[PDB]
Symmetry: D7
Subunit: 110 residues, 14 copies
């Protein structure tokens, strides 16, 4: 029906690399995803919104050069609780760069 | 890049209903998905393979008219362990009808 | 905005008694609730769909005359698992009468 | 019977947005809800009392611009325990702005 | 304000004995308590409705002559789950005699 | 038998408010309750002894204007452990005002 | 003040042996203990009421000749749950002889 | 046989009050109890030795005027662990006044 | 002071074997131990009373020829619960032969 | 066989007191117990070696005049962890006086 | 150094299918793997010994046509416990066909 | 089919020692393993990529001369969490030397 | 000092195979081990006594041809509880053949 | 077969004492044990390698004169975690003297 194209990437060894475009349907997103990223990482496909404003959730981030998907929770004092890696930690929102919020995920692997 | 169209449906109150077709990319499936279904159910989209042969995994099923997504496990004696509902149960593979195997899942809701 | 009137009742000591009508808005229900009931029971107001078809969920039910709100789960062989009371139990679907499905709940008490 | 109109809003991505007014019945509230908000958020509707005075309970809050519903508990030293998000935390009552106390919740999703 | 008199009793060593009448306010009972008992038992006062119809709840009962307060739960097959003593058990509804349902309890001992 | 009148109040949103007098029997209290209060709070009625001398127990208190029922425990150094709220805490006996001790509780809600 | 004499015994290796009379005060017992025993067993003195009628509680018993103190709980069918020994068990009330109920216990060992 | 009189008291709301003398048999105490107290508190009688020298155990104490029965444990640095109340705490031995050690306890309430 | 000699044995691989006499003092036993055994087993020395009458406790037994120390508990029906080995079990009192009851235990190994 | 005499004592209320000599066989001790104590405490008899050199284990100790049996564990910095009483604690090796090490324990009470 | 060639296969949806040979070193196996299979299944490579004699361990099996890797444990009565799938079960050794025992496993995915 | 030669080593007592080369197929590695090591350690064979860039994962490391396989997790501030040994710890990324990432493990011991 | 030779074997895949003799010292066994086996099995060496008579313990056994090391426990009725494998089971002592009792174990692997 | 002599010792009360040589077989050690010790301690024999270089493991140590077997773990900052005694602790590598690493253990006591 409604074909939609999204820029594709792969995330491996914490390095983000451009890839084939991915064809998806607009029905995948409740909110319109205009500037989006489809990131292929460990058997899953993460749909990212580069326009998203900081808010608790799952995010694509860059921490001192390393790229990854982490769950961010704001703490008082412009701080962040960062989960998703083998061990969670805290830091200032300025110690990290957010590339966008994950709006949806696709997996083939239960 | 490679647009693929799948028949769409919605699953609600255990009733399967046809719906808009869904545009997906072939890169979504490692094994080719020829006769497939895209079922929108509770904020997720399940991709089902109508051609799959019975094997342990996540399935779209019809139990005495009710349609649902359940985890099936074969047990000696042509029996099945059926999980996924509020309470798991057992029954013969002949007491249930399999509509297809879930090959992948898309979710917006973490 | 949009005023909607629902027949009201109170449930106490397993007896259903009619009561004042309740004014609600249509925005409370994603699916249209046409033939509905508002049951006041223990500090909560349960909105029920009398038209609902049997499907796993929370139901207003009549068991040998006693009325109650219970979690119903279909088991192969026209059976039911009944939860919600002090001790769950099973029975056949014909041993119980369903009045309707709870589609929403309002509570003041956390 | 008794129709009552409340200003309606939606809360999403931690942003509060005005919306359609909601028609409710005064029987919903034991205490009179004069200046109130009906906030639609994730399949639930929260009724907020803007006039409430700080007291332990469920609150609509604004923390450095973010809007959310949190469980507040006063600690000695004008301090607060804030629960409800992925990770609880403490802070001064002056580090957060209270917009109103939740006096009731409607939910369609069990 | 509204003085109400209830026949009083004491429960000790599982023997029910008449006692001084008790003066209570009608405001103590949401539903009217017409034929009631006030049973003093172990630092508490149980208010009992002799007219109650069997329903899941806390009841004053007589089991083979012994009088006690038990939590009763109906089970399929005219059966009962009886809790409240040191060890819960099951039996037929005909194996026990109900004297009334507790509608309220007063206690001075936290 | 013996009718006794006690001043009634309701406690809600941490505010105490006078209300209907309540009629109670003297048999409710082992020790004489001369200057008492009956506080209606969350489906229960607390009987308070304004004359009580500080001693570990359940009290009606006033902390910086907020009124509540809390379990107090004296700690060396004129200090107090205050429980009952979502999160317990300590403080000096002079940082809280005691209105009276709960000598009994009536409830209809198990 | 009020001196009271009770026949004394010792219980050891499940054998009841007569012993010195024990002088106690009537204030020890809320109900009058007319025909009583004072049984010295493992550092404690149990006060038994030989006239007690069977009721759930702590009993001095004789099972197939062996004497011991057990917690008895009546079960439907003239049955008993017998706890207190290394492993509890059930039996009929006729399989055991009750010598009296323990109405009080004195201990020097915490 | 051997009648022994002990001065009696009652402990309530943390206030010790003289009462009727209690008649007890010397067989109750392995060590001779010369200057003793019999404290009636919450359905139990505590036998206290006023002569006891500080040692870990159950004690009758006076903490800033409040009288209670507490479990005392000496800690290095003339400190004490005080247990028995709703919340245990530590303090210096000089912050508490010991009135005597509990040598035995009688109870009618299992 | 008071020397007492007891016939000694060692118990190994479930075989009882006579050995050196063991010199013990009578103060070791509250009850006189006239006909006793001193059994050396796995770094411990069990003192056994060959004259003891069956009663719940620790015994030296002979089961189908195997000798061991077990915890015996009488069950209704001339039955016994036998614990102490890797897996407890039940049997009639006539399926086992009791050699004596352990009245005390000496150990070097904590 | 081999009679051995040890100086006996009783430990009660943290006071050590001389007592009857105890006759024991040398077979009780793997290492020779030359200068030993037999301490009767709470139904057990502790054999202590006054000559033992400090090492982790069970010890008879003297702390600010109080005598007790404690489990001692060396911690770097000439420190000790003291266990055995209701609440463990640490201190310096010089804050406690050791009287001997427990080498064996006899008990009649399981 | 020592190149070794093993017949390769893939196991997917319980179907075993031949594939590219796999080159391995003899140093991967302590016991010589003469007739072996290298089966690729879910990101892991299983090395199977077709000649193995039944013994508890991990096995490549065929149950009613379905192919899988399972942990087998012999039970008295020519029986087998089969683990590895979502729900273990038992069956006769003749209800299953063993294809070989897994001697080693290679994984890339931790 | 496709033979590949990898330098081999053994890791024992934290010392890495050269050993026989290992023949492996390229099918073992999704990504090309150009400069690889095969580390034999405690019954397993670790395949390491000497050119891997620092990224969260399993690594072969050299800490102050000691060589081991550890799970590394980057923490803000050029820090690392090091797991795998008996007790995890943190340190700067420069306090450790990374020799390569483990991309695969072969094991014979389940 | 005292060199002792023992017949060696290896146990693998449930097959017992003769091997190099092992040289051990007689100090390894408290009881003399005259005809003994040293079974190397999974990094440990089990020393077996072929002359042992049945008794609860760890045994080298032969079950329908399979050789293994199991914990045996005698049950009434000439039965055995057999533990050590993935799943314990029972059977008659005549359904199993005992080769010897393990008297000691040596391990290099913690 | 291959006899090997090792210097023997006994470890008791934390004192190390030379003893008879122990004859073992070289097959006990995968790595050659040239300068080794056989330490008899608590019914077990520890085989120690005096030449071992510091690495995580079980060690024979000397802490301020005291000799024991402890589990050592290196921590950043030339520190050690020391386990094995009743309470683990930390300290610098220089606060402890290592005598050798345990390479194997023999035990008769399960």
């Amino acid at each position: 029906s409604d074909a939609k194209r999204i820029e594709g990437f792969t995330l491996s060894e914490e390095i983000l690399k451009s890839d084939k475009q991915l064809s998806v349907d607009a029905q995948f997103f409740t909110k319109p995803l205009t500037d989006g990223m489809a990131i292929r990482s460990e058997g899953k496909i993460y749909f990212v919104d580069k326009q998203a404003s900081l808010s608790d959730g799952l995010w694509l981030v860059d921490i001192e050069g390393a790229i990854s998907i982490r769950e961010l929770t704001k703490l008082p004092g412009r701080k962040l609780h960062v989960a998703g890696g083998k061990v969670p930690f805290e830091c200032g929102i300025d110690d990290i760069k957010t590339l966008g919020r994950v709006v949806g995920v696709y997996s083939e692997v239960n």
